[PDB]
Amino acid sequence: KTKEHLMLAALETFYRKGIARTSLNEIAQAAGVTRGALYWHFKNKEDLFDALFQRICDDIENCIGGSWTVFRHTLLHFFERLQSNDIHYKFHNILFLKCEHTEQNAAVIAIARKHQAIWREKITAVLTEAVENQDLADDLDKETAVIFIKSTLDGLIWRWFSSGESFDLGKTAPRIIGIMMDNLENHPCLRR
Amino acid sequence: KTKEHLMLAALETFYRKGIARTSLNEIAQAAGVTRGALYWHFKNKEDLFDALFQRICDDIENCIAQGGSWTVFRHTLLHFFERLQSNDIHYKFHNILFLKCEHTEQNAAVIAIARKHQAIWREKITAVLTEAVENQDLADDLDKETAVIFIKSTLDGLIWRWFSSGESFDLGKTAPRIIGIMMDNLENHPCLRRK
Ligand SMILES: C#C[C@]1(O)CC[C@H]2[C@@H]3CCc4cc(O)ccc4[C@H]3CC[C@@]21C
Ligand SMILES: C#C[C@]1(O)CC[C@H]2[C@@H]3CCc4cc(O)ccc4[C@H]3CC[C@@]21C
C-alpha cells in the first residue's frame, strides 16, 4: 500500500545521508506525508529499517535442474540484482557502508543481525539438502561451511562497495562463486 | 613522546565513538595536550588517521621473520589474523576501519586516506604475486589482477564477517583453514588463469 511509498523514502534517505544521521521527520518529508501520518505505519527508524530488510529477503525467496544446481542460480541471480535492481543496490550499500556500529545505531544493528542470522539458518538447510542429495560430501563440515560462504560472498560485496565499484562485478562474481562452489564440493579444509 | 600519546587517544575515541562524531578537540582532552600541542603534531583528523594507518602497516611490515617466498606470505597472513586477536591496537583499528567509518560526506575527508593505504596493499599484493610466478610457485598465466581482488575479498570478507558478527566464531581456527583454501586456490585453480 502507501506503506511501500513511505519505505522507498526511508530507503532513499538512508542512502543519501546514512542511518544514524537520518530522522523520521526527514523521511516523512521524502514521501510527503505528515510525521503523525507515518507514525501510524512505523513508529521509528528501526521499524522502517526492519520493513526494508524484509522486502529484500522476499525478493530473493521469490526468485527461485537439481536443487543444488538451482542454488548457484539463485546466488548468481543475487549478484546481478545487486547491479541492475535499484533497491538491492541501494539497500546493501546502506547495509554495508552507512550502518556504523555506534550507539546512535545500536538498535538498528540488532535488527540487521537478526536477518543475517535467518540467512545463516537458511544457508545450513541448503547444504543439508545437498549432502543427502549426493551433490556434496557425506563428511562436509557445516559450521565452517557457513563462515566460508558468508566470508567469501559478503567479502566480495564489501570489497566492491568500499572500493567505489572499482571492478566489473558481473564478470568477477560468477568466477568467485564458481571457485567457491568447486571448493564446497572438493576441498577438505571443509571436512569434519 | 606526546606524539604517541595523542595517537592512542585518537584510537580509543575513534573506537568508542566512530570516526565522524570525533572532533580534533576530543582527541586532545583525552590525550592530556591542548589544541596547540595537538595542532603542532597534526594538521587535522585525516592525518592523525593517516598516522595510525601507517603505524599498523609499520607494525605489519616490521615483523618479517623466517623456507621460500610464497612460503612467507602464508606466514605474515597467519601472523596478521593472530595480531587481530592478541594485539589491542590492531584489533581496535580494523574494528574502526571495518565498522565505525561510515561512507558519508564528512568522513569523506578520511576515506581517501583509507583508500590510499588500501591501494598500497593492492600493489604489495600484486608484488608478492609477481615474485611467486617468477619463483615458479604460481603459474605463469595467473591472471594476477583477479588474484588481487580474490585475495582481499576473501580476507577482508573473513575480517568483516568476524567483526560484524560480534566475533561469533574462532578466528584462530577459521583463518588458517580459510587462508589454506585460498592459497591452494591461487596455486591450482583454473578460473584464475587468463586464456
Ligand atoms: C546476505 C548475504 C550473503 O552473505 C551475501 C549473498 C547472500 C546469499 C544470496 C542468495 C542466497 C540464496 C540462498 O538459497 C540462500 C541464501 C542466500 C543469500 C544469503 C547469504 C549471502 C551469501
Ligand atoms: C588490511 C587488509 C587485507 O585486506 C586483509 C589482510 C591483508 C594482508 C595482510 C598481510 C599482507 C602481506 C603482504 O606481503 C602484502 C599484503 C598484506 C595485506 C594485504 C591486504 C589484506 C589482504
Residue numbers in the entry:
A (entry chain D): 10 to 73, 82 to 209
B (entry chain C): 10 to 75, 82 to 210
Question: Can you quote the paper on this entry?
Answer:
Transcriptional regulator MtrR inhibits the expression of the multidrug efflux pump operon mtrCDE in the pathogenic bacterium Neisseria gonorrhoeae. A member of the ubiquitous TetR family, MtrR is entirely alpha helical and comprises a helix-turn-helix (HTH) DNA binding motif and a C-terminal ligand binding/dimerization domain. Here, we show that binding of human steroidal hormones results in a comformational change in the MtrR structure rendering it incompatible with DNA binding, thus revealing the structural mechanism of MtrR induction.
In addition to these three gonadal steroids, we also tested the binding of ethinyl estradiol (NDR), which is a synthetic estrogen used in some hormonal contraceptives, and found that it binds MtrR with a Kd of 0.94 ± 0.6 µM. Structures of MtrR bound to PTR, TES, and NDR were subsequently solved by molecular replacement at resolutions of 2.31, 2.22, and 3.20 Å, respectively. The stoichiometry of MtrR bound to EST, TES and NDR is 1 ligand:1 protomer. Of all mutations, D171A affected MtrR binding most significantly resulting in a 2.9-fold increase in Kd for progesterone binding, a 7.0-fold decrease in testosterone affinity, and no observable binding to β-estradiol or ethinyl estradiol. No positively charged side chains are found in the core of the binding pocket, however, three residues, K167, R176’ (‘ indicating the residue is from the other protomer of the dimer), and R137 coordinate a phosphate ion outside the ligand binding pocket in all subunits, although the density is ambiguous in the MtrR-NDR structure, likely due to the limited resolution of the structure, and was thus omitted in the refinement step for this structure. The center-to-center distance between the “recognition” helices of the HTH motifs in the DNA bound structure is 36.8 Å. In the presence of testosterone, MtrR W136L shows a weaker activation for mtrC and comparable activation to the MtrR WT for rpoH, while MtrR R176E shows significantly less activation for both genes. Lastly, we found that ethinyl estrogen could induce expression of mtrC and rpoH but only when the exposed strain produced a wild-type MtrR.
